[PDB]
Design a binder for this molecule. Structure first.
Ligand SMILES: O[C@@H]1[C@@H](O)[C@H](O[C@@H]2[C@@H](O)[C@H](O[C@@H]3[C@@H](O)[C@H](O)OC[C@H]3O)OC[C@H]2O)OC[C@H]1O
Length: 395
């Protein structure tokens, strides 16, 4: 007998019940392979992973956003090439998802889900304030909605400021809308002014403009994602900029365990910006998966083949958690919120990975720091953009 160890960040009880049913089924079909799921909370996982990967405590598999840390971990010899065990994975999963985890002919991981960040909103609170959420197409319209919400005495936005990344979604999206894919491409290459360019300065300027409306909950800087999601679920804030995993999370974090119910819930894409080079269809999100740590056993790929299979992924789409990567599992996307989000992801010409993840722990950490820093007045838009660029050039 051998044990496959998979480290993950999932907290949802319905997701874990599905994962455990899949593991139980796999263990019956593979009597010599056991599966151990190892939970570590998102923030703790990101901070502790570097130590874990250099140690004897490392698992076979661990959750991954791809992006910058994945590239450096692969180059540093911290991952295991499973190309010789990837045939079924390649047959059952999206080609793009598989390619996100492949480098230099080496398959270092496999995809689990794709996601979109957008504005979840409360239709009940919007109606109270006089706002038609389906009519918010522009950033100026969004800001007008913020003012209306404030006028009605409703906290406009819930944000998990303590964790930083929930605020970075604003800076990132504004940069995307101002500059388009081309400004971002130049910035990654450090061409011209790079990340210190006009679109990134504009992003901070517009973030500062939002912040000046005081749209967040009191104490937002001490709030993590869980608190922010709870506030939205408890009808105490009208808007939550977040990935699509929030649907189930806001319900779990609500005191009533239901949150904003479907009749009261809306979702909108990030709006467009006047004079911007970006399109409203461009999406921020990503392709998340599981990476193989150096030393991973072949049985880990056998587990992954089954865990990421069509039937498995169909269940996870049916419980409204993920937009799947397994071929055919999109049949599980019956919920209209998730069905629409899946079409946006598919139609997106630019599908950008979360900036913090695209840039790696250091430079992404700077983006996270400057997002809350702009809001708090620590740095100006210009200083913020310059910091990102300088850290990126050194990387
Ligand atoms: O760097 C962030 C990255 O941390 C973020 O990761 C999300 C993750 O938050 C989400 O998990 C939720 C848990 O945090 C929570 O404790 O329980 C509910 C979970 O849904 O899973 C999706 C990941 O992508 O993504 C955005 C990056 O900028």
């Amino acid at each position: 007998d051998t044990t496959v160890r998979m480290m993950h960040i999932e907290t949802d009880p319905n997701v874990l019940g599905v994962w455990e049913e899949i593991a139980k089924d796999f263990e019956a079909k593979n009597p010599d392979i056991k599966v151990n799921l190892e939970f570590l909370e998102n923030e703790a996982f990101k901070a502790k992973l570097p130590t874990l990967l250099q140690s004897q405590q490392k698992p076979d598999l661990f959750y991954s956003w791809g992006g910058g840390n994945f590239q450096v971990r692969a180059e540093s010899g911290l991952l295991e090439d499973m190309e010789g065990y990837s045939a079924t994975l390649n047959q059952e999963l999206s080609a793009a998802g598989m390619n996100a985890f492949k480098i230099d002919g080496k398959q270092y991981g496999a995809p689990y889900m794709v996601s979109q960040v957008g504005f979840w909103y409360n239709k009940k609170l919007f109606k109270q304030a006089g706002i038609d959420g389906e009519s918010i197409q522009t950033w100026d319209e969004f800001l007008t909605a913020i003012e209306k919400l404030k006028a009605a005495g409703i906290t406009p936005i819930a944000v998990g400021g303590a964790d930083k990344w929930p605020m970075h979604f604003y800076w990132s999206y504004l940069a995307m809308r101002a500059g388009g894919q081309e400004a971002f491409a130049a910035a990654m290459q450090d061409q011209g002014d790079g990340f210190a360019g006009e679109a990134f300065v504009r992003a901070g300027e517009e973030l500062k403009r939002l912040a000046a409306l005081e749209p967040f909950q009191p104490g937002f800087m001490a709030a993590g994602y869980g608190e922010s999601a709870g506030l939205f679920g408890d009808y105490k804030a009208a808007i939550h900029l977040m990935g699509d995993w929030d649907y189930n999370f806001q319900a779990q974090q609500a005191v009533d365990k239901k949150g904003v119910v479907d009749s009261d819930l809306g979702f909108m894409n990030f709006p467009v910006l006047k004079g911007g080079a970006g399109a409203g269809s461009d999406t921020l999100g990503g392709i998340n998966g599981f990476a193989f740590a150096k030393g991973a056993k072949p049985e880990a790929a056998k587990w992954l083949e089954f865990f990421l299979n069509e039937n498995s992924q169909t269940k996870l789409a049916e419980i409204d958690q993920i937009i799947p990567v397994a071929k055919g599992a999109d049949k599980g996307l019956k919920n209209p919120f998730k069905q629409k989000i899946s079409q946006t992801i598919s139609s997106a010409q630019w599908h950008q990975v979360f900036f913090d993840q695209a840039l790696g722990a250091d430079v992404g950490g700077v983006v996270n720091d400057i997002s809350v820093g702009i809001v708090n007045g620590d740095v100006t838009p210009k200083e913020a953009a310059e910091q990102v660029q300088e850290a990126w050039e050194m990387r």
